[PDB]
Amino acid sequence: SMSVKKPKRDDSKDLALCSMILTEMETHEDAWPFLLPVNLKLVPGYKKVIKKPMDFSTIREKLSSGQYPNLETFALDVRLVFDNCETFNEDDSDIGRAGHNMRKYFEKKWTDTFK
């Protein structure tokens, strides 16, 4: 509360470390469904159903331009990419399986880097 603060966690390396995680996600072989925004002209249903589209290129541009105020807003956009994938794709499809694999990969890197 006012003039009563918990001890200060060092957040000075968060930007560099989120960039490193994101590079590792970009270079995973199963990243291909997620590298670029879904083409809203060419994929029926996507625009109406997926209220907040997200992809790795869009996260990379936000990261590079100071649009994440803290590491939790970064994790929210990564998770959004996987939540959107599960909304639109069957679990038993190449893209469905890709999204489960990438989510697992992300969550481990996140825990090992920060928790």
CATH fold, domain 1-115, is Histone Acetyltransferase; Chain A (1.20.920)
Which approach determined this entry?
X-ray
- Please tell me the distance from the alpha carbon of residue 46 to that of residue 3, in angstroms, as a whole number: 49
Structural domain boundaries in the chain: 1-115
